[PDB]
């Protein structure tokens, strides 16, 4: 993985040694080159994972998440450089450095063989993410958003550390390849019940599980655009990736331990989808939309079927592009009217015809129109949970209806109707913004032609 670690590290001297007016050009250009080389990780085999060294490996689960991570860095750079234009040069370079350091931790997190190494990197992502929100958010309550985000995580992550160290003592190793062969069944006991919860609750908070989700809308409303993009697209999936890995060593106890979380997820997805129908902050609506989509991922992971794991992988990738695109669309309006209130600026299709098309496409993928990979992932989960219990189709189907309702409600409210009379600063869409939207949706739709590369190891 050094061919990705080192050039990512070199982005830092590139940014600091660039001419003052070239920092965005150079960092964007070279981060795109790193993203191109990331496609060499597609050398996956049917039986064995791609095991580079004693520290790093890449299977079909981590590879799509790696590609998404390195694709997202140039997009965040493009999305950030406008609202940071007045920032002084050193603080701009520090901002870009946080984004680069976030990529560094993320690609190492997704490729670590040993689970303590994954833990340290998994925890290290907190620092630049917290700094990005509290330093470069606009509003007063970004400070509280940082503390909620920080302490929700550490409330779950410290028990995980204790469990991980306990598991190594008992088993002798935390190398994930070793765990596949030395794994032993988890028998029933109160000790194993708390081992299970310690192994899982940290990832539940990240997803976030319904009932542990209130940090997320708080974080999004305060974060700058790049913060929301990485948070929605990658940082949530750290918990999804963590669960997909650690469930290996939790059988058969997951059989009955999953129930309360499945109930929270299955009911939570309806609750959060309904909440979206009444949200007045556009960013908060997209944040609640993520909670609803990630509830499906949690169910998929917990029921542990080949179909559910494939759906979970596709849903995680598909949501990452879709939700990141929606924050970018929401942010493009915000950079004109300086408000996140959804009802403030209406009828924008009359004023911004092509941005209306991007809104339309983002909404269509959000409601999982066939054959977008959004639907492929959702459909696979719906398929698998029906076998788990046929009654789940009722909650799955109802959630589909509500998702279509709030997705299109977003579109109708902001883009259709009459334009607000007094808002007279809706300038034409910039090339940067149109490129940013298209750099989300085009790869997302191209993945329809070859979905297999996002379906994960169970494919």
């Amino acid at each position: 993985m050094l061919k990705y670690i080192i050039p990512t590290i070199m982005l830092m001297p590139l940014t600091w040694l660039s001419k003052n007016n070239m920092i965005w050009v150079n960092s964007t250009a070279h981060s795109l080159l790193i993203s191109f080389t990331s496609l060499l990780l597609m050398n996956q085999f049917g039986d064995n994972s791609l095991n580079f060294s004693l520290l790093f490996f890449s299977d079909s689960l981590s590879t799509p998440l790696l590609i998404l991570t390195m694709w997202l860095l140039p997009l965040m750079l493009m999305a950030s450089q406008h609202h940071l234009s007045k920032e002084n040069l050193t603080r701009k370079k520090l901002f870009i450095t946080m984004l680069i350091s976030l990529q560094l931790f993320l690609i190492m997190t997704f490729t670590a063989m040993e689970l303590i190494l994954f833990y340290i990197l998994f925890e290290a992502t907190l620092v630049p993410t917290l700094i990005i929100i509290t330093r470069w958010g606009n509003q007063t309550e970004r400070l509280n958003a940082g503390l909620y985000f920080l302490f929700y995580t550490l409330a779950g992550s410290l028990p995980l550390l204790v469990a991980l160290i306990y598991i190594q003592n008992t088993v002798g190793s935390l190398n994930f390849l070793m765990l596949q062969y030395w794994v032993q069944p988890v028998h029933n006991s109160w000790s194993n019940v708390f081992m299970w919860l310690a192994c899982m609750m940290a990832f539940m908070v990240k997803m976030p599980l319904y009932g542990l989700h209130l940090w997320l809308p708080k974080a999004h409303v305060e974060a700058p655009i790049a913060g929301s993009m990485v948070l929605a697209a990658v940082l949530l999936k750290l918990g999804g990736y963590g669960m997909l890995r650690i469930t290996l060593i939790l059988n058969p106890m997951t059989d009955f331990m999953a129930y309360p979380f499945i109930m929270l997820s299955l009911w939570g997805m309806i609750m959060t989808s309904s909440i979206c129908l009444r949200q007045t902050d556009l960013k908060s609506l997209i944040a609640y939309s993520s909670v609803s989509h990630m509830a499906l991922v949690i169910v998929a992971i917990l029921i542990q079927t080949p179909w559910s794991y494939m759906g979970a992988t596709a849903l995680m990738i598909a949501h990452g592009l879709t939700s990141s695109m929606l924050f970018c669309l929401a942010n493009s309006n915000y950079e004109r009217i300086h408000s996140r209130t959804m009802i403030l600026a209406r009828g924008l299709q009359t004023l911004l015809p092509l941005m209306a098309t991007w809104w339309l496409l983002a909404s269509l993928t959000n409601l999982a129109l066939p054959p977008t990979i959004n639907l492929i992932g959702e459909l696979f989960v719906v398929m698998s949970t029906f076998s788990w219990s046929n009654i789940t189709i009722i909650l799955m189907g109802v959630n589909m209806v509500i998702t279509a309702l709030y997705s299109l409600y977003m579109l109708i409210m902001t883009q259709r109707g009459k334009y607000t009379y007094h808002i007279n600063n809706i300038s034409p869409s910039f090339t940067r913004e149109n490129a940013l939207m298209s750099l989300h949706i085009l790869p997302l739709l191209l993945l329809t032609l070859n979905p297999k590369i996002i379906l994960g190891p169970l494919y």
Partner: protein, 57 residues
């Protein structure tokens, strides 16, 4: 015929021939506990290094 010993004479250490056998265990000591086995051999590098969690050295 008695001659008074000179200054320093009576503080001399002398030697006596005794047929009394030298005592073997005047302290009545028990057998001493056996020492811990002596650790020996050639020092080699640690097998795969420190082996601390993920470290490879």
């Amino acid at each position: 015929g008695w001659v008074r010993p000179d200054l320093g004479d009576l503080s001399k250490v002398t030697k006596v021939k005794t047929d009394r056998p030298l005592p073997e265990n005047p302290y009545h000591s028990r057998a001493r506990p056996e020492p811990n086995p002596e650790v020996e051999g050639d020092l080699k590098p640690a097998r795969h290094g420190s082996r601390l969690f993920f470290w490879t050295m």
